[PDB]
Design an enzyme around this catalytic site. Structure first.
Site, PDB file in Angstrom:
ATOM      1  N   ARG B  54       0.931  -1.242   0.074  1.00 17.43           N
ATOM      2  CA  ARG B  54      -0.072  -0.039   0.114  1.00 17.43           C
ATOM      3  C   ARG B  54       0.911   1.326  -0.043  1.00 17.43           C
ATOM      4  O   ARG B  54       1.707   1.514   0.969  1.00 17.43           O
ATOM      5  CB  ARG B  54      -0.951  -0.101   1.170  1.00 17.43           C
ATOM      6  N   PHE B  59       1.307  10.699   1.840  1.00 15.29           N
ATOM      7  CA  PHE B  59       0.824   9.991   3.162  1.00 15.29           C
ATOM      8  C   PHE B  59       1.835   9.063   3.417  1.00 15.29           C
ATOM      9  O   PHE B  59       2.400   9.258   4.665  1.00 15.29           O
ATOM     10  CB  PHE B  59      -0.437   9.456   3.020  1.00 15.29           C
ATOM     11  N   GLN B  62       3.337   1.556   3.235  1.00 18.01           N
ATOM     12  CA  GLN B  62       2.980   0.295   4.239  1.00 18.01           C
ATOM     13  C   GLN B  62       3.395  -0.971   3.670  1.00 18.01           C
ATOM     14  O   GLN B  62       3.147  -1.331   2.657  1.00 18.01           O
ATOM     15  CB  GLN B  62       1.358   0.330   4.597  1.00 18.01           C
ATOM     16  N   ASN B 101      -2.099  -1.405  12.524  1.00 18.77           N
ATOM     17  CA  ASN B 101      -2.753  -2.431  13.394  1.00 18.77           C
ATOM     18  C   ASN B 101      -4.232  -2.359  12.746  1.00 18.77           C
ATOM     19  O   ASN B 101      -4.768  -1.832  11.820  1.00 18.77           O
ATOM     20  CB  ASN B 101      -2.714  -1.847  14.528  1.00 18.77           C
ATOM     21  N   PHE B 112       4.152   1.222   8.841  1.00 17.08           N
ATOM     22  CA  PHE B 112       4.277   2.303   7.684  1.00 17.08           C
ATOM     23  C   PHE B 112       5.324   3.469   7.756  1.00 17.08           C
ATOM     24  O   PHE B 112       6.103   3.505   9.040  1.00 17.08           O
ATOM     25  CB  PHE B 112       2.746   2.793   7.418  1.00 17.08           C
ATOM     26  N   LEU B 121      -3.245  10.314  13.429  1.00 19.94           N
ATOM     27  CA  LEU B 121      -2.430   8.753  13.660  1.00 19.94           C
ATOM     28  C   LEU B 121      -2.185   8.852  15.326  1.00 19.94           C
ATOM     29  O   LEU B 121      -2.073   7.697  15.843  1.00 19.94           O
ATOM     30  CB  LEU B 121      -1.819   8.075  12.804  1.00 19.94           C
ATOM     31  N   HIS B 125      -1.542   4.667  16.683  1.00 24.77           N
ATOM     32  CA  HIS B 125      -0.537   3.675  16.011  1.00 24.77           C
ATOM     33  C   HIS B 125       0.787   4.023  16.905  1.00 24.77           C
ATOM     34  O   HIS B 125       0.999   5.275  16.994  1.00 24.77           O
ATOM     35  CB  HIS B 125      -0.282   4.130  14.631  1.00 24.77           C
TER      36      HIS B 125
HETATM   37  C1  LIG Z   1     -11.458   8.420   3.812  1.00 27.54           C
HETATM   38  C2  LIG Z   1     -10.442   8.012   2.981  1.00 27.54           C
HETATM   39  N1  LIG Z   1      -8.924   7.329   3.792  1.00 27.54           N
HETATM   40  C3  LIG Z   1      -7.827   8.284   4.173  1.00 27.54           C
HETATM   41  C4  LIG Z   1      -7.651   9.563   3.543  1.00 27.54           C
HETATM   42  C5  LIG Z   1      -7.660  10.694   4.624  1.00 27.54           C
HETATM   43  C6  LIG Z   1      -7.185  11.977   4.072  1.00 27.54           C
HETATM   44  N2  LIG Z   1      -7.097  12.957   4.980  1.00 27.54           N
HETATM   45  C7  LIG Z   1      -7.200  12.598   6.500  1.00 27.54           C
HETATM   46  C8  LIG Z   1      -6.292  13.970   7.233  1.00 27.54           C
HETATM   47  N3  LIG Z   1      -7.179  14.803   7.030  1.00 27.54           N
HETATM   48  C9  LIG Z   1      -6.546  16.253   7.744  1.00 27.54           C
HETATM   49  C10 LIG Z   1      -6.937  15.469   5.476  1.00 27.54           C
HETATM   50  C11 LIG Z   1      -7.287  14.360   4.667  1.00 27.54           C
HETATM   51  C12 LIG Z   1      -7.201  12.135   2.574  1.00 27.54           C
HETATM   52  N4  LIG Z   1      -7.247  11.271   1.877  1.00 27.54           N
HETATM   53  C13 LIG Z   1      -7.381   9.757   2.193  1.00 27.54           C
HETATM   54  C14 LIG Z   1      -7.276   8.801   1.110  1.00 27.54           C
HETATM   55  C15 LIG Z   1      -6.386   8.844   0.312  1.00 27.54           C
HETATM   56  O1  LIG Z   1      -8.513   9.264   0.455  1.00 27.54           O
HETATM   57  C16 LIG Z   1      -8.898   8.038  -0.504  1.00 27.54           C
HETATM   58  C17 LIG Z   1      -6.888   7.333   4.732  1.00 27.54           C
HETATM   59  C18 LIG Z   1      -7.544   6.032   5.078  1.00 27.54           C
HETATM   60  C19 LIG Z   1      -7.408   5.220   5.762  1.00 27.54           C
HETATM   61  C20 LIG Z   1      -8.135   3.959   5.957  1.00 27.54           C
HETATM   62  C21 LIG Z   1      -9.410   4.082   5.322  1.00 27.54           C
HETATM   63  C22 LIG Z   1      -9.590   5.040   4.477  1.00 27.54           C
HETATM   64  C23 LIG Z   1      -8.934   6.209   4.535  1.00 27.54           C
HETATM   65  C24 LIG Z   1      -7.876   2.671   6.824  1.00 27.54           C
HETATM   66  C25 LIG Z   1      -8.677   1.529   6.593  1.00 27.54           C
HETATM   67  S1  LIG Z   1      -7.394   0.401   7.535  1.00 27.54           S
HETATM   68  C26 LIG Z   1      -6.700   1.819   8.216  1.00 27.54           C
HETATM   69  N5  LIG Z   1      -6.972   3.028   7.531  1.00 27.54           N
HETATM   70  C27 LIG Z   1      -5.558   1.357   9.117  1.00 27.54           C
HETATM   71  C28 LIG Z   1      -4.464   0.413   8.589  1.00 27.54           C
HETATM   72  N6  LIG Z   1      -4.771  -0.979   9.030  1.00 27.54           N
HETATM   73  C29 LIG Z   1      -4.642  -1.924   8.430  1.00 27.54           C
HETATM   74  O2  LIG Z   1      -4.054  -1.871   7.106  1.00 27.54           O
HETATM   75  C30 LIG Z   1      -4.602  -3.320   8.807  1.00 27.54           C
HETATM   76  C31 LIG Z   1      -4.755  -4.428   7.867  1.00 27.54           C
HETATM   77  C32 LIG Z   1      -3.325  -4.331   8.476  1.00 27.54           C
HETATM   78  C33 LIG Z   1      -3.215  -5.387   9.774  1.00 27.54           C
HETATM   79  C34 LIG Z   1      -3.276   1.101   9.211  1.00 27.54           C
HETATM   80  O3  LIG Z   1      -2.480   0.283  10.171  1.00 27.54           O
HETATM   81  N7  LIG Z   1      -2.462   1.766   8.433  1.00 27.54           N
HETATM   82  C35 LIG Z   1      -1.178   2.501   8.973  1.00 27.54           C
HETATM   83  C36 LIG Z   1      -1.566   3.736   8.957  1.00 27.54           C
HETATM   84  C37 LIG Z   1      -2.006   4.509   7.680  1.00 27.54           C
HETATM   85  C38 LIG Z   1      -3.377   3.587   7.292  1.00 27.54           C
HETATM   86  N8  LIG Z   1      -3.058   1.942   7.127  1.00 27.54           N
HETATM   87  C39 LIG Z   1      -3.782   4.091   5.755  1.00 27.54           C
HETATM   88  O4  LIG Z   1      -3.468   3.328   4.879  1.00 27.54           O
HETATM   89  O5  LIG Z   1      -4.148   5.591   5.826  1.00 27.54           O
HETATM   90  C40 LIG Z   1      -4.300   6.052   4.735  1.00 27.54           C
HETATM   91  C41 LIG Z   1      -4.281   7.716   4.723  1.00 27.54           C
HETATM   92  C42 LIG Z   1      -4.582   8.091   3.457  1.00 27.54           C
HETATM   93  C43 LIG Z   1      -3.121   8.175   5.598  1.00 27.54           C
HETATM   94  C44 LIG Z   1      -5.696   7.826   5.639  1.00 27.54           C
END
Ligand SMILES: CCn1c(-c2cc(N3CCN(C)CC3)cnc2[C@H](C)OC)c2c3cc(ccc31)-c1csc(n1)C[C@H](NC(=O)[C@H]1C[C@@H]1C)C(=O)N1CCC[C@H](N1)C(=O)OCC(C)(C)C2
Ligand SMILES: Nc1nc2c(ncn2[C@@H]2O[C@H](COP(=O)(O)OP(=O)(O)NP(=O)(O)O)[C@@H](O)[C@H]2O)c(=O)[nH]1
Ligand SMILES: [Mg+2]
Lengths: 169, 164
Positions: B54, B59, B62, B101, B112, B121, B125
């Site tokens: 990922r 951002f 991962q 997590n 990540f 976060l 995390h």
């Molecule tokens: C709304 C759309 N969206 C967004 C998002 C958020 C913003 N902003 C937030 C802050 N403001 C101030 C500005 C706008 C803008 N653009 C988007 C995205 C690009 O729009 C498509 C995120 C996100 C995360 C999840 C679901 C939807 C989500 C999610 C779904 S599971 C998860 N997080 C946590 C993830 N667990 C797992 O994988 C488990 C399976 C393993 C064991 C996990 O530990 N990590 C590590 C930390 C990062 C996280 N993954 C991840 O990937 O973060 C993606 C990120 C883009 C950073 C945040």
């Protein structure tokens, strides 16, 4: 061929992606893979018409509850999903519905209530509870299992029928 | 002294470069030791050969699922999952190394690397390290990512271990 923009919403872990993958790919996996955002396309025949389903599978993770307005404005109909063994996901339904009505500024948005995971024995949301909620919204209620495929096509196809009626009114 | 580990990154099997990390064993010893041991492979399993599944430009990158190789797996050296050690350190900017997590107390092996500040976060995390050398390698990985994180090339940890 008419296109329909469907959006699948609901609390994290209720089975939004399991349902969509079962419709698209005809299989189920028990692994947990929480969604960021995924889009799919599927051609189907509903009541003798060819339809193209554009399906948005959204994130249930409540941390990002403030980032739903744009997909709710774009979507034409909503599959509002809860799990029949998760009473909190059933309470979460009303918040999603209120947000959709708020964002689209309409009491008249095509929606279907879906109670997923009906293959499980450990039910905590009884079927009458759900039927009355759906009756109070004026929308259909369909019980599904993404694991067995029970009701899966019926849920998506009913939503298409709800959009169709909204357009041909 | 805080240990240092390295990843040699490849893109579709072709070498890109080395990233090295400082692990904050002084602040989060149990979490740093998990990542260190998985980087050396000394338990008979670990990061070598696994991929960054990922990558979302702006951002983070991962990775770390070496048990299922589909973004859902991984395991710690303490069992499948272990608790959140502490939340002392914050996601302050690019290069922060932090645990992925599935909610409270579900740390395994997935991690990540931040490419921007991700302060929402904080407290969710466990931060446990930072890039020391090779942040331009992480920056170079971003173009193989996408809005939802799907990668357009296979980004792998071709080799990894501990530096003196
Ligand atoms: C709304 C759309 N969206 C967004 C998002 C958020 C913003 N902003 C937030 C802050 N403001 C101030 C500005 C706008 C803008 N653009 C988007 C995205 C690009 O729009 C498509 C995120 C996100 C995360 C999840 C679901 C939807 C989500 C999610 C779904 S599971 C998860 N997080 C946590 C993830 N667990 C797992 O994988 C488990 C399976 C393993 C064991 C996990 O530990 N990590 C590590 C930390 C990062 C996280 N993954 C991840 O990937 O973060 C993606 C990120 C883009 C950073 C945040
Ligand atoms: N028994 C059973 N399990 C199901 C069913 N639907 C989904 N699951 C399981 O429930 C878990 C969550 O499913 P998933 O489809 O990922 O839920 P989601 O609503 O897409 N989660 P998110 O909002 O985080 O993306 C998985 O372990 C999946 O296998 C179902 O009908 N029956
Ligand atoms: Mg999902």
């Amino acid at each position: 061929m008419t296109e329909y923009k469907l959006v699948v919403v609901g609390a994290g872990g209720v089975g939004k992606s399991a349902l969509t993958i079962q419709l698209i790919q005809n299989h189920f996996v028990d692994e947990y893979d929480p969604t960021i955002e995924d889009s799919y396309r599927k051609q189907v025949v509903i009541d003798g018409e060819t339809c193209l389903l554009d399906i948005l599978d959204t994130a249930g993770l409540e941390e990002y509850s403030a980032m739903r307005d744009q997909y709710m404005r774009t979507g034409e109909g909503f599959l509002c999903v809860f799990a029949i063994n998760n009473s909190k996901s059933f309470a979460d339904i009303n918040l999603y519905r209120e947000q959709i009505k708020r964002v689209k500024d309409s009491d008249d948005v095509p929606m279907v209530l879906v109670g997923n995971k009906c293959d499980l024995p450990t039910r905590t949301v009884d079927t009458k509870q759900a039927h009355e909620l759906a009756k109070s919204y004026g929308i259909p209620f369909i019980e599904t299992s993404a694991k067995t495929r029970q009701g899966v096509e019926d849920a998506f196809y009913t939503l298409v029928r709800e959009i169709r009626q909204y357009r041909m009114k | 002294v805080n240990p240092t580990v390295f990843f040699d990154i490849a893109v579709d099997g072709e070498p890109l470069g080395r990233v090295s990390f400082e692990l904050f064993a002084d602040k989060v010893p149990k979490t740093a030791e998990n990542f260190r041991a998985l980087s050396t492979g000394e338990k008979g399993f670990g990061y070598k050969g696994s991929c960054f599944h990922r990558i979302i430009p702006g951002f983070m990158c991962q990775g770390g699922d070496f048990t299922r190789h589909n973004g859902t797996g991984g395991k710690s050296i303490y069992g499948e999952k272990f608790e959140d050690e502490n939340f002392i350190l914050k996601h302050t900017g690019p290069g922060i190394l932090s645990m992925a997590n599935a909610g409270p107390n579900t740390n395994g092996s997935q991690f990540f690397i931040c490419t921007a500040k991700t302060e929402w976060l904080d407290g969710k995390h466990v931060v446990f390290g930072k890039v020391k050398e090779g942040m331009n390698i992480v920056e170079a990985m971003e173009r193989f990512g996408s809005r939802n994180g799907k990668t357009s090339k296979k980004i792998t940890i071709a080799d990894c271990g501990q530096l003196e």
